[PDB]
Amino acid sequence: KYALVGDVGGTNARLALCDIASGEISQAKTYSGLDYPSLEAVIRVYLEEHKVEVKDGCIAIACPITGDWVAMTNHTWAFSIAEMKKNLGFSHLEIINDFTAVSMAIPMLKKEHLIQFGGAEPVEGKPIAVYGAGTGLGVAHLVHVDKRWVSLPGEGGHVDFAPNSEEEAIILEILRAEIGHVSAERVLSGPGLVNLYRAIVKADNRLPENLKPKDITERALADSCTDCRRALSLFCVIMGRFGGNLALNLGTFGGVFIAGGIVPRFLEFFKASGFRAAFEDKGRFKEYVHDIPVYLIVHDNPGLLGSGAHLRQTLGHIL
Amino acid sequence: KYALVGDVGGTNARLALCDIASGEISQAKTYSGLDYPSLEAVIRVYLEEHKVEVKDGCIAIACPITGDWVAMTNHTWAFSIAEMKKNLGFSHLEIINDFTAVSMAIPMLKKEHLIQFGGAEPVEGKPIAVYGAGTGLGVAHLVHVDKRWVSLPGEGGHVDFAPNSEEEAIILEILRAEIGHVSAERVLSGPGLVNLYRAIVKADNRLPENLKPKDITERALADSCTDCRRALSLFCVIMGRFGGNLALNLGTFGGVFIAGGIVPRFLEFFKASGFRAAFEDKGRFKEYVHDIPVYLIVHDNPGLLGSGAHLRQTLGHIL
Ligand SMILES: OC[C@H]1O[C@@H](O)[C@H](O)[C@@H](O)[C@@H]1O
Ligand SMILES: OC[C@H]1O[C@@H](O)[C@H](O)[C@@H](O)[C@@H]1O
């Protein structure tokens, strides 16, 4: 009747139960990864606090899933998938990338979970691209073949940052002299927002403050600091440029989806930003992406919802 | 018994016959688009010099294939797919992008048709990335779902150029002044070799010669112009960076394939260039792409071969 679903990112692990018949998510609880020694220990606690027998599960984790060994870059947890499934006695245990799960949540979303940013209307049967600026920059794609939804994972957040304008080029130069390779995550993320502010200040021959991401948005929203105001606007433009590159690359006439990370915290600024202009700023191919819609997912837990969908399809349910 | 396959790009129009039972290609001929008023005229002309009755066809064309109206924009022809099919009395007439066709040639290629550049071995069932620098920059992706090879076409050659080094950033700066948005096609193509040469010369505060892509390649191999050898060396580096971004974005552990448009004319220079190092210069995710193989396709007619593969799969045959 019920299956276990999870969304683990860095220091937070979120666990919930999923209705096998319908895919509804219920009984969601967030745990702290610092207070538990392993992912397995957290699952043991959840399964007894809720008095539910569970035999199938699917956990989303924010790191590359390649083989049986899962080592978290942000967290210290590391485990073998086949051993956890045996240890917990599960019949199915699916370990997937966090944006693999987010991509799988799209067929479950209603119109009330989306806010459109330009474009006209999706083309049925054409690919879909998903990305989000959160702890890092996650990217995934989704294609419908026959009756199966096929998620295409990857590490698209670590491709080379692609500056277009002179302002964007100046950011690359300051970041390049610090770390070498500058990936898109270094600018399109929570820490990326800090990098934008630091480089904009360093370019003015000044030392940046030790500002946290939430500080930069709040000062930019209050217009109390021009360095932060510039950073936030530059972030919104780079967001559109990244998404427009994805849409061209995979011909995603099914739409481009933004899994809400830090963006919903400055949603009104985002709507008035230059995001949509940057999305279409593609030379002779502005008209190619002009009608492709863009959606922000305001669902409070797409990762849990899409973990259940991925499992149910794996178990033979048609979404 | 036979079906018609075609590969049309720019000025040329290549037509051939395809064995429906086997997928073998034969009786290929290269017509000129300047000497005929339409692609229909070429097909009508070809179908009578070879005296073969044909009902099914697949033509690959180097332009985006969005709807029924097809306009090349690299040629004067433009036509409706539905209208051309009716005129020829075909039952099936598939019209596809030229790198959709190249992507479907991959299942039919043998070891003799591949040259490996680094990486170790492909993982079965993982996505494949295909790209090629010719008159334009083509990109396609290929995934094997159940029994079917699914081609994901796109216009990925028109994404933003992504400079990494200081020398690359200069190229973007100079080209941005001349054309505005700078696509990867502007540096990674036949014409892009000239842009790389010209930006290098203008960066040196000199005036560029009116060279052609043939001039740059031959002068580079002859050590006749240091401007032209630098342009060629930077071409090979950016080729590697671009391919590495493709492998990160879609997790292409099935391999990255480079369709040779201009590469084979300087094959040995390419082998000695910094292509592989550029392919893997991806910060923390060098190890992620380190083992992914890169193959150069040395088949002289992959577009015809893949067009047959696409039509055959559409007709119900298994590849
Ligand atoms: O969490 C979003 C993304 O951040 C990146 O740093 C990770 O490598 C991805 O696996 C993850 O999907
Ligand atoms: O020929 C390779 C590529 O060149 C580009 O200019 C075209 O827009 C693509 O449709 C084509 O696939």
Author numbering:
A (entry chain B), B (entry chain A): 3 to 321
What does the paper say about this structure?
Glucokinase (GLK) catalyzes the first reaction in the glycolytic pathway and is a target for regulation in a wide range of organisms. Group II GLKs are ATP-dependent enzymes that lack the classical repressor open reading frame kinase (ROK) sequence motif and contain more than 50 partial and complete protein sequences, including Escherichia coli GLK. To date, there are no ecGLK structures reported together with the other substrate ATP or the product ADP. This work presents the structure of apo ecGLK bound with phosphate and the structure of ecGLK in complex with both glucose and phosphate, implying a role for phosphate in regulation of the GLK activity. In the ternary complex, phosphate is bound adjacent to glucose, and the B factors for the α4, α5 and α9 helices were further reduced, while r.m.s.d. spikes were observed at the end of the β10 sheet and within the α6 helix of the β-domain. This structural characterization suggests that phosphate could influence the activity of GLK by altering glucose binding and modulating interactions with a loop-interacting regulatory protein.
A ternary complex consisting of GLK, glucose and phosphate is also reported in this work. The crystals of the phosphate-bound glucose–ecGLK complex were obtained by soaking ecGLK with 5 mM glucose and were grown in 100 mM bis-Tris pH 6.5, 200 mM magnesium chloride, 25%(w/v) PEG 3350. The crystal structure was determined by molecular replacement and refined to an R factor of 0.2034 (Rfree = 0.2580) at a resolution of 2.54 Å. The small and large domains retain the α-helices and β-sheets found in phosphate-bound ecGLK while there are domain shifts to account for the glucose binding. The small domain shifts down, closing the binding cleft, and the large domain maintains its relative position with slight shifts into the center of ecGLK. The phosphate-bound glucose–ecGLK complex crystallizes in a more highly ordered space group (P212121) compared with the phosphate-free form (P1211), suggesting that phosphate binding stabilizes the conformation of ecGLK. The phosphate binding stabilizes Arg286 and forms hydrogen bonds to the O2 and O4 of phosphate in chain B. This process reinforces the enzyme structure, lowers its flexibility and may improve glucose binding. In the phosphate-free structure, the O atom of Glu187 forms hydrogen bonds to both glucose and water, while in the phosphate-bound complex it forms a new hydrogen bond to Arg286 NH2.
